[PDB]
Design a protein around this ligand. Sequence first.
Ligand SMILES: *C(=O)Cc1ccc(-c2ccc(-c3ccc(CC(*)=O)cc3)s2)cc1
Ligand SMILES: *C(=O)Cc1ccc(-c2ccc(-c3ccc(CC(*)=O)cc3)s2)cc1
Ligand SMILES: *C(=O)Cc1ccc(-c2ccc(-c3ccc(CC(*)=O)cc3)s2)cc1
Ligand SMILES: *C(=O)Cc1ccc(-c2ccc(-c3ccc(CC(*)=O)cc3)s2)cc1
Ligand SMILES: *C(=O)Cc1ccc(-c2ccc(-c3ccc(CC(*)=O)cc3)s2)cc1
Ligand SMILES: *C(=O)Cc1ccc(-c2ccc(-c3ccc(CC(*)=O)cc3)s2)cc1
Ligand SMILES: *C(=O)Cc1ccc(-c2ccc(-c3ccc(CC(*)=O)cc3)s2)cc1
Ligand SMILES: *C(=O)Cc1ccc(-c2ccc(-c3ccc(CC(*)=O)cc3)s2)cc1
Ligand SMILES: *C(=O)Cc1ccc(-c2ccc(-c3ccc(CC(*)=O)cc3)s2)cc1
Ligand SMILES: *C(=O)Cc1ccc(-c2ccc(-c3ccc(CC(*)=O)cc3)s2)cc1
Ligand SMILES: *C(=O)Cc1ccc(-c2ccc(-c3ccc(CC(*)=O)cc3)s2)cc1
Ligand SMILES: *C(=O)Cc1ccc(-c2ccc(-c3ccc(CC(*)=O)cc3)s2)cc1
Ligand SMILES: *C(=O)Cc1ccc(-c2ccc(-c3ccc(CC(*)=O)cc3)s2)cc1
Ligand SMILES: *C(=O)Cc1ccc(-c2ccc(-c3ccc(CC(*)=O)cc3)s2)cc1
Ligand SMILES: *C(=O)Cc1ccc(-c2ccc(-c3ccc(CC(*)=O)cc3)s2)cc1
Ligand SMILES: *C(=O)Cc1ccc(-c2ccc(-c3ccc(CC(*)=O)cc3)s2)cc1
Ligand SMILES: *C(=O)Cc1ccc(-c2ccc(-c3ccc(CC(*)=O)cc3)s2)cc1
Ligand SMILES: *C(=O)Cc1ccc(-c2ccc(-c3ccc(CC(*)=O)cc3)s2)cc1
Ligand SMILES: *C(=O)Cc1ccc(-c2ccc(-c3ccc(CC(*)=O)cc3)s2)cc1
Ligand SMILES: *C(=O)Cc1ccc(-c2ccc(-c3ccc(CC(*)=O)cc3)s2)cc1
Ligand SMILES: *C(=O)Cc1ccc(-c2ccc(-c3ccc(CC(*)=O)cc3)s2)cc1
Ligand SMILES: *C(=O)Cc1ccc(-c2ccc(-c3ccc(CC(*)=O)cc3)s2)cc1
Ligand SMILES: *C(=O)Cc1ccc(-c2ccc(-c3ccc(CC(*)=O)cc3)s2)cc1
Ligand SMILES: *C(=O)Cc1ccc(-c2ccc(-c3ccc(CC(*)=O)cc3)s2)cc1
Ligand SMILES: *C(=O)Cc1ccc(-c2ccc(-c3ccc(CC(*)=O)cc3)s2)cc1
Ligand SMILES: *C(=O)Cc1ccc(-c2ccc(-c3ccc(CC(*)=O)cc3)s2)cc1
Ligand SMILES: *C(=O)Cc1ccc(-c2ccc(-c3ccc(CC(*)=O)cc3)s2)cc1
Lengths: 5, 5, 5, 5, 5, 5, 5, 5, 5, 5, 5, 5, 5, 5, 5, 5, 5, 5, 5, 5
Amino acid sequence: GAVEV
Amino acid sequence: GAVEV
Amino acid sequence: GAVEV
Amino acid sequence: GAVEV
Amino acid sequence: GAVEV
Amino acid sequence: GAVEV
Amino acid sequence: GAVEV
Amino acid sequence: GAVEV
Amino acid sequence: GAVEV
Amino acid sequence: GAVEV
Amino acid sequence: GAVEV
Amino acid sequence: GAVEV
Amino acid sequence: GAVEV
Amino acid sequence: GAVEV
Amino acid sequence: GAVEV
Amino acid sequence: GAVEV
Amino acid sequence: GAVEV
Amino acid sequence: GAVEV
Amino acid sequence: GAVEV
Amino acid sequence: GAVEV
Ligand SMILES: *C(=O)Cc1ccc(-c2ccc(-c3ccc(CC(*)=O)cc3)s2)cc1
Ligand SMILES: *C(=O)Cc1ccc(-c2ccc(-c3ccc(CC(*)=O)cc3)s2)cc1
Ligand SMILES: *C(=O)Cc1ccc(-c2ccc(-c3ccc(CC(*)=O)cc3)s2)cc1
Ligand SMILES: *C(=O)Cc1ccc(-c2ccc(-c3ccc(CC(*)=O)cc3)s2)cc1
Ligand SMILES: *C(=O)Cc1ccc(-c2ccc(-c3ccc(CC(*)=O)cc3)s2)cc1
Ligand SMILES: *C(=O)Cc1ccc(-c2ccc(-c3ccc(CC(*)=O)cc3)s2)cc1
Ligand SMILES: *C(=O)Cc1ccc(-c2ccc(-c3ccc(CC(*)=O)cc3)s2)cc1
Ligand SMILES: *C(=O)Cc1ccc(-c2ccc(-c3ccc(CC(*)=O)cc3)s2)cc1
Ligand SMILES: *C(=O)Cc1ccc(-c2ccc(-c3ccc(CC(*)=O)cc3)s2)cc1
Ligand SMILES: *C(=O)Cc1ccc(-c2ccc(-c3ccc(CC(*)=O)cc3)s2)cc1
Ligand SMILES: *C(=O)Cc1ccc(-c2ccc(-c3ccc(CC(*)=O)cc3)s2)cc1
Ligand SMILES: *C(=O)Cc1ccc(-c2ccc(-c3ccc(CC(*)=O)cc3)s2)cc1
Ligand SMILES: *C(=O)Cc1ccc(-c2ccc(-c3ccc(CC(*)=O)cc3)s2)cc1
Ligand SMILES: *C(=O)Cc1ccc(-c2ccc(-c3ccc(CC(*)=O)cc3)s2)cc1
Ligand SMILES: *C(=O)Cc1ccc(-c2ccc(-c3ccc(CC(*)=O)cc3)s2)cc1
Ligand SMILES: *C(=O)Cc1ccc(-c2ccc(-c3ccc(CC(*)=O)cc3)s2)cc1
Ligand SMILES: *C(=O)Cc1ccc(-c2ccc(-c3ccc(CC(*)=O)cc3)s2)cc1
Ligand SMILES: *C(=O)Cc1ccc(-c2ccc(-c3ccc(CC(*)=O)cc3)s2)cc1
Ligand SMILES: *C(=O)Cc1ccc(-c2ccc(-c3ccc(CC(*)=O)cc3)s2)cc1
Ligand SMILES: *C(=O)Cc1ccc(-c2ccc(-c3ccc(CC(*)=O)cc3)s2)cc1
Ligand SMILES: *C(=O)Cc1ccc(-c2ccc(-c3ccc(CC(*)=O)cc3)s2)cc1
Ligand SMILES: *C(=O)Cc1ccc(-c2ccc(-c3ccc(CC(*)=O)cc3)s2)cc1
Ligand SMILES: *C(=O)Cc1ccc(-c2ccc(-c3ccc(CC(*)=O)cc3)s2)cc1
Ligand SMILES: *C(=O)Cc1ccc(-c2ccc(-c3ccc(CC(*)=O)cc3)s2)cc1
Ligand SMILES: *C(=O)Cc1ccc(-c2ccc(-c3ccc(CC(*)=O)cc3)s2)cc1
Ligand SMILES: *C(=O)Cc1ccc(-c2ccc(-c3ccc(CC(*)=O)cc3)s2)cc1
Ligand SMILES: *C(=O)Cc1ccc(-c2ccc(-c3ccc(CC(*)=O)cc3)s2)cc1
């Protein structure tokens, strides 16, 4: 899981 | 699961 | 998981 | 996991 | 894990 | 892990 | 781990 | 680990 | 580990 | 470890 | 504190 | 604190 | 403190 | 302190 | 202190 | 102190 | 002190 | 003191 | 003192 | 004193 901002 | 903002 | 900003 | 900024 | 900036 | 800037 | 700048 | 600048 | 500058 | 400059 | 996301 | 998302 | 993301 | 990311 | 990333 | 990254 | 990276 | 890297 | 690297 | 590397 990649979190953006 | 990727979270955006 | 890569986090951006 | 690579973190950007 | 490589961290950028 | 290599850190850039 | 190599650190740049 | 080699550090640059 | 070699340090440059 | 060799240090340059 | 207030948070706006 | 207040939050607006 | 306030946070805006 | 305030943080904006 | 304030942080902007 | 303030930090901007 | 302030830091900008 | 201030640091910019 | 200030440092810029 | 200031240092720039
Ligand atoms: C709690 O009872 C022990 C525990 C805690 C955490 C974990 C995890 C294993 C893998 C995790 C993970 C999944 C996805 C992401 C984002 C994208 O890759 C990050 C971390 S948490 C297991 C047991
Ligand atoms: C709790 O009883 C122990 C526990 C805690 C957490 C987990 C997890 C395994 C994988 C997780 C996960 C799924 C999706 C995401 C987002 C996208 O990848 C992140 C993390 S949580 C298992 C047991
Ligand atoms: C807690 O009960 C012990 C514990 C804590 C952390 C972990 C983890 C193993 C792998 C993790 C991880 C997954 C994804 C990411 C982002 C993308 O790679 C980072 C870290 S957390 C297991 C047991
Ligand atoms: C806590 O109960 C003991 C503990 C703490 C940390 C870990 C980890 C093993 C690998 C980790 C990791 C996963 C992904 C990333 C980003 C991309 O590579 C960094 C670190 S945390 C295990 C047990
Ligand atoms: C805590 O209970 C003891 C502990 C602490 C740290 C670790 C780690 C092993 C490997 C780690 C790591 C993973 C990824 C990265 C970024 C990319 O390579 C850095 C460090 S943390 C294990 C047990
Ligand atoms: C803490 O409980 C004892 C401890 C502390 C640190 C470690 C580590 C082993 C390897 C580490 C590492 C992983 C990746 C990187 C970046 C890329 O190579 C640097 C350092 S931390 C184990 C036990
Ligand atoms: C702490 O509990 C004792 C301790 C402290 C440090 C270490 C390390 C072993 C190897 C380390 C390392 C990994 C990667 C890098 C960057 C690229 O090579 C530097 C240093 S830290 C073990 C136990
Ligand atoms: C702390 O508990 C005792 C201690 C301190 C330091 C170490 C280290 C062994 C090797 C280290 C190292 C790894 C990588 C680099 C950069 C590239 O080579 C430099 C130094 S630190 C072990 C135990
Ligand atoms: C601390 O608890 C005692 C201690 C201190 C230092 C060391 C080291 C052994 C080797 C080191 C080293 C690794 C890499 C480099 C750069 C490239 O070669 C320099 C020095 S530190 C062990 C125990
Ligand atoms: C501290 O607890 C006692 C101590 C101090 C220093 C050392 C070292 C052994 C070898 C060292 C070294 C490694 C690499 C380099 C650069 C490239 O060769 C220089 C010096 S420090 C052990 C115990
Ligand atoms: C004993 O009472 C120790 C203690 C614990 C917590 C506090 C605080 C009261 C209010 C605080 C605070 C929250 C948010 C913000 C920013 C958003 O408005 C500032 C201050 S901390 C005092 C003493
Ligand atoms: C006992 O004192 C435990 C404790 C620790 C910390 C706090 C907090 C005081 C203020 C906090 C805060 C305000 C705003 C924000 C920005 C998020 O929107 C983050 C944290 S936490 C209270 C009690
Ligand atoms: C004993 O009473 C320790 C203690 C615990 C909590 C508090 C707080 C009371 C109010 C707080 C607070 C909440 C939110 C905000 C921002 C939103 O309005 C600021 C302050 S913390 C005090 C003492
Ligand atoms: C006992 O003191 C446990 C405790 C810890 C922290 C707090 C909090 C006080 C203020 C908090 C807060 C206000 C606003 C926000 C922004 C979200 O919209 C986040 C946190 S938590 C109370 C009791
Ligand atoms: C005993 O009371 C020790 C103690 C603990 C915490 C505090 C604080 C009260 C308010 C604080 C604070 C929170 C947020 C901000 C920025 C956002 O408004 C500034 C200050 S810390 C005092 C004493
Ligand atoms: C007892 O004193 C434990 C404790 C530690 C730290 C604090 C905090 C006071 C102010 C905090 C804070 C305000 C704003 C922000 C920016 C995020 O949006 C981060 C942290 S934490 C309270 C009690
Ligand atoms: C006994 O009270 C020791 C103690 C602990 C904490 C503090 C602080 C109160 C407020 C602080 C602070 C928080 C955030 C900022 C930047 C954001 O507004 C500045 C100052 S530290 C005092 C005494
Ligand atoms: C007891 O004193 C433990 C303790 C330690 C540190 C603090 C803090 C005071 C101010 C903090 C802070 C403000 C802003 C920021 C920028 C992030 O958005 C980071 C940290 S932490 C309180 C109690
Ligand atoms: C006893 O009280 C020792 C003590 C501990 C902490 C402090 C501080 C109070 C406020 C501080 C501070 C936080 C953030 C900033 C930059 C962001 O605003 C400046 C100053 S440290 C005082 C005494
Ligand atoms: C008891 O005194 C423990 C303690 C140590 C340090 C502090 C801090 C005071 C100011 C801090 C700070 C402000 C801004 C920033 C920039 C990040 O956004 C970093 C650190 S920490 C409080 C209590
Ligand atoms: C007893 O009180 C010893 C003590 C500890 C800490 C301090 C400080 C208070 C404020 C400090 C400071 C924080 C950040 C900055 C730059 C960002 O604003 C400057 C000064 S240190 C005083 C006495
Ligand atoms: C007893 O109080 C000894 C003591 C400890 C610390 C200090 C300081 C207070 C403020 C300092 C400072 C922090 C940051 C900067 C640059 C960023 O603004 C300058 C000065 S040191 C005084 C006395
Ligand atoms: C008793 O108080 C001994 C003592 C300790 C520390 C200091 C200082 C206060 C402020 C200092 C300083 C910090 C940063 C800079 C450059 C960035 O602004 C200059 C001066 S040292 C005084 C007395
Ligand atoms: C008793 O107080 C002995 C003592 C200790 C330290 C100092 C200093 C205060 C400020 C100093 C300083 C820091 C940085 C710079 C360059 C960056 O601004 C110049 C001077 S040393 C005085 C007396
Ligand atoms: C008690 O006096 C111990 C002590 C020793 C030295 C100092 C310093 C004063 C000024 C320092 C300094 C300023 C700038 C730079 C350039 C780096 O960016 C390096 C060192 S150290 C304070 C207290
Ligand atoms: C008793 O106070 C002995 C003592 C110790 C240190 C000092 C100094 C104060 C400021 C100094 C200084 C720091 C950096 C620079 C170059 C960068 O600005 C010049 C001077 S030494 C005085 C008396
Ligand atoms: C008690 O007096 C111990 C002590 C010794 C030396 C100093 C210093 C004063 C000025 C220093 C300095 C300034 C600039 C630079 C260039 C680096 O960027 C190096 C050293 S050290 C303070 C206290």
